[PDB]
Amino acid sequence: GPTKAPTKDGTSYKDLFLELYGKIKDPKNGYFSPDEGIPYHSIETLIVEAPDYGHVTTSEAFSYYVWLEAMYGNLTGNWSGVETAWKVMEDWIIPDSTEQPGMSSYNPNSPATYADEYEDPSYYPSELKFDTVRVGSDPVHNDLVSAYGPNMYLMHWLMDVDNWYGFGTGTQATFINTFQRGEQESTWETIPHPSIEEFKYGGPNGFLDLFTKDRSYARQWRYTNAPDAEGRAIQAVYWANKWAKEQGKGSAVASVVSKAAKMGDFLRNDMFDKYFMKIGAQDKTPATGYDSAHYLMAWYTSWGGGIGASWAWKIGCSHAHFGYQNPFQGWVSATQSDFAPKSSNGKRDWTTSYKRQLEFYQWLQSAEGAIAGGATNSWNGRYEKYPAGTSTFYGMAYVPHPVYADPGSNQWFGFQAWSMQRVMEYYLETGDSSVKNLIKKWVDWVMSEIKLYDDGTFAIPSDLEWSGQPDTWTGTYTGNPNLHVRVTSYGTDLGVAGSLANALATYAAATERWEGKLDTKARDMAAELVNRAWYNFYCSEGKGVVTEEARADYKRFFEQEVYVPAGWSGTMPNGDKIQPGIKFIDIRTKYRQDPYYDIVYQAYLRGEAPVLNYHRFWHEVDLAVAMGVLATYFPD
Numbered sequence: 001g002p003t004k005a006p007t008k009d010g011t012s013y014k015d016l017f018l019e020l021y022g023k024i025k026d027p028k029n030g031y032f033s034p035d036e037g038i039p040y041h042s043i044e045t046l047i048v049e050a051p052d053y054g055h056v057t058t059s060e061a062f063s064y065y066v067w068l069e070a071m072y073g074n075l076t077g078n079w080s081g082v083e084t085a086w087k088v089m090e091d092w093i094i095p096d097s098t099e100q101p102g103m104s105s106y107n108p109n110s111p112a113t114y115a116d117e118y119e120d121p122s123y124y125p126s127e128l129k130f131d132t133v134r135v136g137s138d139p140v141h142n143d144l145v146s147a148y149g150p151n152m153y154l155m156h157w158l159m160d161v162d163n164w165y166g167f168g169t170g171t172q173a174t175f176i177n178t179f180q181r182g183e184q185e186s187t188w189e190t191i192p193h194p195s196i197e198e199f200k201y202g203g204p205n206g207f208l209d210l211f212t213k214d215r216s217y218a219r220q221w222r223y224t225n226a227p228d229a230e231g232r233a234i235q236a237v238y239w240a241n242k243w244a245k246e247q248g249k250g251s252a253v254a255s256v257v258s259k260a261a262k263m264g265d266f267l268r269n270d271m272f273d274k275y276f277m278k279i280g281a282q283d284k285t286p287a288t289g290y291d292s293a294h295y296l297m298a299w300y301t302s303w304g305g306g307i308g309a310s311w312a313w314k315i316g317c318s319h320a321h322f323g324y325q326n327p328f329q330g331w332v333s334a335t336q337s338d339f340a341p342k343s344s345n346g347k348r349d350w351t352t353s354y355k356r357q358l359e360f361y362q363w364l365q366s367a368e369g370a371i372a373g374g375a376t377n378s379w380n381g382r383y384e385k386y387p388a389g390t391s392t393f394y395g396m397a398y399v400p401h402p403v404y405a406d407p408g409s410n411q412w413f414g415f416q417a418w419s420m421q422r423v424m425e426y427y428l429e430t431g432d433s434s435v436k437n438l439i440k441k442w443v444d445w446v447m448s449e450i451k452l453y454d455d456g457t458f459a460i461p462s463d464l465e466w467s468g469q470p471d472t473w474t475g476t477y478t479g480n481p482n483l484h485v486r487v488t489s490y491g492t493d494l495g496v497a498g499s500l501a502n503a504l505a506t507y508a509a510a511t512e513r514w515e516g517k518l519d520t521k522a523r524d525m526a527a528e529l530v531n532r533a534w535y536n537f538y539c540s541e542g543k544g545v546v547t548e549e550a551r552a553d554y555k556r557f558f559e560q561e562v563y564v565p566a567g568w569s570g571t572m573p574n575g576d577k578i579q580p581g582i583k584f585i586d587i588r589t590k591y592r593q594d595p596y597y598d599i600v601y602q603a604y605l606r607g608e609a610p611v612l613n614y615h616r617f618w619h620e621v622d623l624a625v626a627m628g629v630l631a632t633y634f635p636d
């Protein structure tokens, strides 16, 4: 568990980085799968967050792995880690040609069939509306095909690394999905299913008719990205390239740079309305050309096609969260020669996008300084009319919690750190004064909310509450006097503390570079966060840092009803019956063999929250990269 670090006082941030790096990479510690070398969500298996099992992982984890290795190359001159990390990503979570059969049959003039989204999972399956609803046209596909051929070079968002659900073979890493039934489907409320749907498992039509209603069903494959992962990966590779070339070792990462540029080009798919409807339509009004482009990183792009028959489809997404933007990666794709898109229009599109993203952050900045949630081009996920008085951004409606409501997607303070960290890197590398007010207001805000205790502990915001709306955007920040944040709780989340330290140190470095005076308070706060995270949460088992958390939410293992339509029946691969009346655990009965099951169940029987220790991959990496940023800009 967490203990006071034995580390000698005054240990350099470089030395801290290299110690923590070593512990992350040590095979005995178990952060990576023995067979593929894929980073798990966490060492521990019983954990329920975005993934619902700890050895399920996400494209996020793959991106953090690349970032870790880039910093290692910076500090040691050894670039093999970057090569290895990108290879693991490309080999596993980026679907290859055999895994995207028939994508060459995609028709950009008939991209997909329309379906409503709904406010509760019990409304699903959602009817596919063939020939009742016309959709718009995809203006980027052919430009990408001309450069790269038929397939998407993006990461699917979720992978069952040791085939725990059984949808794949042996213990092989397997593409899966969970979330599918709208904004109120929490992680506790999903029915896990295979991305490659061969009807082997589930019901007669596999899992398909839990989610979509149609006259017939065909075997099919489907992937969905999370563009913050790709963005982070590319961001990392910008730094790998910069640092490697400083060392005269740019050739070691040149191939990875080319792949990152390509991935960046494919992220243009995330810039479009779900069904290529006109931005601002407030109706199901199909667009052509770029009239469906919001030029933000929306929550996903998804694509799919047939197995055993040749057909394909693609959707964007109408919802954008500030937390998923990355104007740094955008600027890299737009402006950096080595990352120049191979397609004819990628550079232009990215130039438009990174600037639009920067406006988005400004529009969303509350009176206090925290960044509010985002916007949608599809009110209620059904292209409904905006309510009276709705504030807008280029025709998109403000929403405080884009995409998901259980919990509200902008309650989590962590998005402030993850996303504004990218804005700091953008300011550092450009000195663009257009974002100075944004970043200074956010820094002064966040630093007013960090608590440093005389006993050497710390607290940072954990949960946020929002009221009001920004003013409608006309190109200039108004101060948004009626958009308000309140911090409702604080905590010691190690990864957020690291990300925040990263943001503050990067900002400090930028102030030194551009402003003629270093913000030493920002520098020092970054140092304090790293120091206090490391010192108070050092893992006694030598695995890095570790949390100790009461998980009151884990009563949902046993209490959460999972919606199944009346009359539907099927089985999970292990034989668990999927039918009305199931709870979370009932379709995941292998959890009863987890080494921490008894602790969680016995706590439940006592009416108590169980207390668990976790080593999340992204926690370890966000802290390590923060140590590295300090080492880079503030050595000694």
Ligand SMILES: OCCOCCOCCOCCOCCOCCOCCOCCOCCOCCOCCOCCOCCO
Pocket (backbone or CB within 6 Å): 049, 050, 112, 113, 115, 128, 157, 177, 179, 180, 212, 224, 226, 300, 302, 304, 311, 313, 412, 414
């Ligand atoms: O010719 C016949 C063809 O007909 C066939 C029809 O084919 C169908 C095609 O269209 C189908 C329409 O389907 C709609 C698809 O939309 C659903 C998308 O669902 C997948 C979305 O995946 C995204 C998952 O999102 C959840 C991830 O959120 C994580 C939040 O991040 C926060 C992480 O921070 C950790 C916090 O830690 C807290 C610890 O205290």
